């Protein structure tokens, strides 16, 4: 998770400048091997998010997720479907086996003149006790 340090304030700024509330196609980086976000690398990443900081207790959203996931794919080579969580009813538990963060619910001049949402929670047993599997048993066999 070395080249994930150089965009650790840079992409998070674009996440935080993204509101939590041309181009066509998909390029693939040549000759770089691709793999999903594996278990021990998610253990390597959940501790990378535990140690580098700036993520815990932040306002999670989907626009921030997609800014983040494609940046992992283009700079680290990982399939950007790993940051998937359980839907609306219930705690937004990760479907990813190894992601130890569950999602609980919680510039300035773009406002007009007179005027006429989630967050992380570290759960180290989400890597072993797949709580999203308890929320979705029939999908995981």
């Amino acid at each position: 998770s070395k080249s994930s340090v150089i965009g650790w304030p840079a992409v998070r700024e674009r996440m935080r400048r993204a509101e939590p509330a041309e181009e066509v196609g998909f390029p693939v980086t040549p000759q770089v091997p691709l793999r999903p976000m594996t278990y021990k690398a998610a253990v390597d990443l959940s501790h990378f998010l535990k140690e580098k900081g700036g993520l815990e207790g932040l306002i999670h959203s989907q626009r921030r997720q997609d800014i983040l996931d494609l940046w992992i794919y283009h700079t680290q080579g990982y399939f950007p479907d790993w940051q998937n969580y359980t839907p609306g009813p219930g705690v937004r538990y990760p479907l990813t086996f190894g992601w130890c963060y569950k999602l609980v619910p919680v510039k300035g001049e773009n406002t007009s003149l007179l005027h006429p949402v989630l967050e992380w929670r570290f759960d180290s047993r989400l890597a072993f006790h797949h709580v999203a599997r308890e929320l979705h048993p029939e999908y995981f066999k």
């Binding site: 510039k107 300035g108 001049e109 773009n110 406002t111 007009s112 003149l113 007179l114 005027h115």
Partner: peptide
């Protein structure tokens, strides 16, 4: 602007 602020 309202909550007039640095980045804009």
């Amino acid at each position: 602007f309202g909550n007039v602020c640095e980045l804009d």
